Design brief:
With 914 residues, the chain is mainly α. It has 44 helices and two strands. Belongs to the NUP186/NUP192/NUP205 family.
């Protein structure tokens, strides 16, 4: 890449980082400049963010002779103001006065005071932390490159030795008082933790006075927030590096013991702790697993150090210790599976598998699986919710305290690493402790049979949920269930599907849904739920309880009950069933067709019945999302069939059918969850089978739709979406849901506009319609009538609808810039703007061609579709440009750094401006 010759420490580290990213993204154009920067940071690399201690000699010097500063080779001149910033920086960071001065000179020189507009001493803080973070992330990248199997073996290995040498301080194979790496790494992480704490304490005290007196943010609050986030990211990088050191066999038993001792003293469930969980897993896999070291005289000695010798106050977080014991036992019991690979003579398999099973089951009662599940849930926790899975994996009890509410999202490399180890743990217990799982099941069944009103243990359920996270979004890994029916994991799947309690069935369907993230996996799950070649004479499938048959019999029953309250467990189960149906349908064409064209299941017809009855909104939402799932891909026959289905129940839900339709629309638009889902459904039903952005001379639904009782076309449906967007959104309190719902509405609109083939209509006017044999002038003329384009345009000329577009676009620019480009906030604004652009691009074809044809038609018909357009607006500009906020916001947003958004603001501004 392009760089200057004499880069200062930070800029140098940033350069190296950029080169490392390149190599990591398979760009080897700058390997030569990468190496030059590597050797340039050798010292810093071995120093591992070591922080020079504050000193009296330099303090006494700085103030007494505040004139000429000499650092290393060069000379600078101090002004009484600069010298004060050094003392301020040295205090804030408890840093060497000289090192502080150096940092401030790099700040002044590079002039990041103006680049970040902050006091000089604050810039020092930021630079100090930037250097640390980049240094550590460079190491993480080097290790990550050393493990990249998709690059030249030579590079992969040379980066390996580089990592061994520069990071872990292990000389290369061709050569050779020091403190071993891991001990240094642990001290480094310790420093970071304490610096965050010390920083938090000081900040708390100062904020307390701030909020009490001035009730406004601290002057350096931005720098504070940044320093916290960094420190946490630093620890995360160190935790990743440590994890690498362990796997690379650089750890000693002592290191393993010192680590466990550190976990034993750990007295807070926080982000730092979760960073160490992968490290723990590696340590367990190294010193106790079958795959790791195999000195059992030691692997068992450690067992007594981990489990036995249990003092009552040995763990500050007893629940953590439980998780540690469980994890260890799961991996350590793998030694005793076979003899072809291991020597098991002298071992009391009987008494031990007894005592092991006991102390493991005890761990579960102590909260082992509540801790592990909570760690997985928090690590994979997303920032915004997918409305189609609200409640999923959220119904099991949790005694583990929430993570401190912080803006500390876990890096992908940490999340992935953790999931990989959970996969191992899941595999270990399933294959090493099947006995324990059978007992859990019997224990829980026995519980809800004899103590229906008492707290039921849910550790078996938790286990399935843990599995769901481990394999979530990883089909390659998930195939280990669908590959070999004789395998352990595949067996566990079949064992779980046996007759189960409602909670365990829900937990199972939750699991399956996360084991179907592609065509192959989804198809496998689909075939699994079938009675495959098994109408009779069942080997696997006779004992199997959970099947499509049971699912559709359970659904079919609940429909007769509700149409003549549902119990929480029942509701949950039905919701898990539906979410599962939806998942497979969208991921598997085989599954989709079967589900939609099966007379035994009668899926569509039955779930539509269910929606008519009085059911919880979240359950009806699940129904709508299934209907959408069956339409994600589609043909014309299926599509027409679906529209026929929907119309049937909208009008005849078992007095006037159109009055019944009013009834159903008013209900479906009630509340976020179900209104959002229904609008999502209608949107999908309008996306042609040929795909969005297609050009065909046909409306995407049965032309004769509504022919029986109403105005032909889907105007009642379009009117519904706009009534939500325009009026019903007023009832949504939660901002993020308001945004999601608005986005849904706007996507519906966008689809109505995009699928309108204007090029086809314009060509018609001049030629086909008036000056030639016109068989098809009618054909297109009818198209112009039925396509939602007319009605959608008519709505876009409505006062309220325009106001809502403005309201959607008008948002707090500060929180807008902080938002993610994919967040509903940004995207909902973008989509609103994009609707305005599209409207402007099509309003001519609408005003001089479509509108008059539609107004003409009804003249003789009779129906005067209740007016929605505002006669005051002769053009779309007359409406939107009456809101001065609009053009102002467009200008503002260009400066918020959201490329796609800005790009849209410009497109619209050009159409508006003079």
């Amino acid at each position: 890449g392009p760089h200057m010759t004499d880069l200062r420490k930070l800029e140098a580290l940033q350069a190296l980082h950029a080169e490392l990213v390149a190599v990591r993204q398979h760009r080897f154009e700058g390997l030569q400049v990468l190496e030059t920067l590597l050797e340039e940071q050798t010292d810093a690399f071995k120093a591992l963010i070591a922080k020079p201690a504050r000193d009296t000699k330099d303090r006494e010097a700085l103030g007494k002779e505040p004139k000429k500063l000499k650092i290393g080779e060069e000379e600078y001149s101090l002004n009484e103001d600069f010298v004060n910033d050094c003392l301020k920086l040295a205090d804030e960071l408890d840093l060497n006065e000289k090192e502080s001065a150096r940092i401030l000179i790099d700040c002044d020189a590079e002039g990041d005071v103006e680049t970040q507009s902050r006091p000089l001493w604050e810039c020092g803080v930021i630079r100090f932390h930037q250097e640390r973070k980049y240094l550590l992330d460079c190491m993480r990248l080097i290790l990550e490159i050393a493990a990249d199997e998709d690059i030249d073996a030579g590079l992969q290995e040379s980066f390996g030795v580089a990592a061994e040498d520069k990071i872990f301080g292990i000389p290369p194979p061709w050569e050779r008082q020091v403190k071993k790496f891991i001990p240094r790494c642990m001290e480094a992480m310790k420093g970071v933790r304490s610096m965050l704490q010390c920083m938090a304490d000081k900040a708390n005290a100062r904020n307390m006075l701030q909020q009490a007196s001035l009730v406004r943010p601290l002057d350096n609050q931005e720098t504070l927030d940044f320093s916290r986030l960094s420190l946490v990211e630093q620890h995360e990088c160190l935790a990743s590096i440590l994890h690498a050191a362990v796997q690379r066999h650089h750890a000693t038993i002592a290191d393993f013991q010192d680590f466990i001792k550190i976990l034993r003293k750990w007295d807070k469930y926080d982000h730092f702790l979760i960073h160490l969980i992968p490290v723990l897993a590696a340590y367990i896999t190294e010193f106790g697993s079958p795959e790791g070291m195999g000195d059992l005289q030691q692997a068992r000695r450690l067992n007594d150090f981990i489990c036995k010798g249990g003092d009552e106050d040995s763990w500050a977080l007893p629940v953590l210790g439980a998780a540690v014991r469980a994890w260890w036992i799961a991996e350590h019991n793998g030694f005793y599976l076979d003899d072809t690979v291991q020597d098991l003579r002298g071992i009391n398999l009987d008494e031990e598998d007894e005592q092991r099973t006991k102390q493991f089951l005890d761990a579960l009662k102590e909260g082992a699986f509540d801790f592990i599940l909570s760690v997985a849930a928090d690590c994979k926790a997303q920032e915004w919710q997918d409305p189609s899975q609200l409640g999923a994996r959220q119904w099991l009890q949790r005694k583990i305290p929430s993570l401190p509410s912080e803006p500390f999202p876990f890096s992908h490399f940490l999340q992935h690493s953790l999931m990989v180890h959970l996969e191992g743990f899941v595999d270990a217990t399933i294959s090493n402790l099947p006995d324990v799982l059978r007992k859990l099941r019997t224990e829980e069944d026995e519980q809800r049979q004899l103590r229906p009103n008492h707290e039921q243990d849910m550790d078996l359920e938790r286990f399935l949920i843990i599995i769901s996270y481990a394999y979530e979004g990883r089909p390659d890994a998930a195939m280990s269930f669908w590959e070999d029916p004789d395998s352990n994991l595949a067996g566990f799947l079949q064992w779980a599907s046996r007759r189960a309690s409602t909670p365990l069935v829900s937990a199972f369907c939750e699991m399956l849904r996360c084991l179907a993230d592609n065509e192959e996996c989804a198809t496998a799950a689909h075939n699994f739920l079938l009675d495959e070649g098994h109408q009779a004479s069942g080997k696997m499938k006779r004992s199997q309880s959970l099947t499509w048959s049971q699912i559709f019999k359970e659904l079919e029953y609940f429909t007769t009950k509700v149409c003549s309250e549902i119990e929480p467990e029942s509701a949950l189960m039905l919701e898990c069933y539906l979410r599962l149906i939806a998942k497979l349908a969208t991921e598997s064409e085989i599954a989709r067709k079967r589900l939609i064209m099966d007379e035994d299941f009668n899926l569509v017809d039955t779930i539509l019945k269910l929606s008519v009855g009085v059911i919880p909104h979240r359950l009806r939402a699940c129904i709508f999302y299934v209907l959408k799932a069956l339409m994600i891909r589609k043909t014309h026959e299926e599509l027409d069939a679906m529209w026929r289905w929907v119309e049937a129940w909208m009008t005849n839900p078992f007095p006037g059918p159109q009055e019944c339709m009013e009834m159903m629309f008013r209900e479906f638009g009630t509340g976020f969850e179900q209104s959002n889902a229904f609008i999502q459904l209608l949107t999908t039903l309008l996306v042609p089978p040929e795909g969005l952005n297609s050009l065909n001379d046909s409306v995407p639904f049965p032309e004769w739709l509504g022919s029986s009782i109403r105005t032909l076309g889907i105007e009642p449906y379009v009117d519904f979406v706009f009534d939500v967007f325009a009026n019903r959104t007023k009832d949504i309190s939660d901002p993020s849901q308001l945004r999601i719902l608005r986005l849904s509405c706007l996507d519906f609109v966008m689809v109505c506009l995009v699928t309108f083939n204007e090029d086809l209509i314009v060509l018609g006017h001049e030629s086909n319609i008036s000056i030639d044999d016109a068989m098809a002038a009618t054909n297109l003329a009818t198209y112009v009538r039925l396509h939602p384009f007319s009605r959608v345009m008519e709505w876009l000329f409505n006062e309220k609808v325009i106001t809502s577009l403005i309201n959607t676009i008008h948002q707090d620019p500060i929180s807008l810039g902080s938002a993610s480009p994919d967040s509903p906030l940004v995207v909902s604004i973008l989509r609103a703007i994009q609707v305005m652009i599209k409207a402007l691009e099509l309003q001519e074809t609408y005003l001089h061609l479509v509108r008059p044809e539609v107004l003409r038609y009804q003249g003789e018909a009779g129906v005067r579709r209740k007016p929605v357009a505002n006669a005051a607006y002769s053009a779309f500009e007359d409406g939107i440009l009456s809101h001065l906020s609009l053009v102002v916001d467009l200008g503002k947003y260009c400066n918020l750094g959201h490329a796609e958004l800005t790009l849209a603001c410009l497109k619209l501004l050009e159409k508006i401006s003079t």
